[PDB]
Amino acid sequence: GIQRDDNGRRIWRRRTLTKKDDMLRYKLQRVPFVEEQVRKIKEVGKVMTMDIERLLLSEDNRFEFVNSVAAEATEYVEKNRDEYGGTKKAIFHVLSNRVNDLGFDRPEAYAESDPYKPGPGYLKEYYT
Amino acid sequence: FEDRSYPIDAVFMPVQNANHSIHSYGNGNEKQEILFIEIWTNGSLTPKEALHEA
Numbered sequence: 001g002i003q004r005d006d007n008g009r010r011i012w013r014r015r016t017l018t019k020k021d022d023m024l025r026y027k028l029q030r031v032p033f034v035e036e037q038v039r040k041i042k043e044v045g046k047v048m049t050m051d052i053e054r055l056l057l058s059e060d061n062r063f064e065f066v067n068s069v070a071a072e073a074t075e076y077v078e079k080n081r082d083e084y085g086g087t088k089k090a091i092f093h094v095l096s097n098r099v100n101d102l103g104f105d106r107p108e109a110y111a112e113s114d115p116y117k118p119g120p121g122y123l124k125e126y127y128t
Numbered sequence: 129f130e131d132r133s134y135p136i137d138a139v140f141m142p143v144q145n146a147n148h149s150i151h152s153y154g155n156g157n158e159k160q161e162i163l164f165i166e167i168w169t170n171g172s173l174t175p176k177e178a179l180h181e182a
Contacts, residue, residue: 032144032168033144033145033168035166035168036147036149036166116151116162117153118153118160118162119153119155121155121156121158122153122154122155122158122160123153123154123155124151124152124153125152125153125154125159127150127152
């Protein structure tokens, strides 16, 4: 059990994977060309879609989850009436908070600006 | 020809991938377009350099 050398320090067997794992070499690689996809997903809003499902994974009844979200969203707007009207939505703020409560990081209410917007009067036309 | 030299079918792309996107902004009658260029290079030249060479 306990083993020490002359200096008095403790020497222990470094537990290491003796055998070899096939899947280890087949899964550590990452694709290099998803920069446009990840940017599109965030801009579209599918990042919340995964978060919405993730919350439902730890839930027992999806009808109770939406009632709890609606109840908490109503609580948010009552406290701060002049915050959840435009770029920030009461429901999205609840969802962002509930994800942040799990220990992950999301922007507040999933709100995103347009860094490339030229002027105040220029609104982004959508290419249908 | 054939002198025990084994040919290598080498692809000569230093730019692994490229893509462009268009953002259109309107101000009632000021239709200006914004062009986004997206460049992936294999390190043989920086994407800024590939933009100039192209």
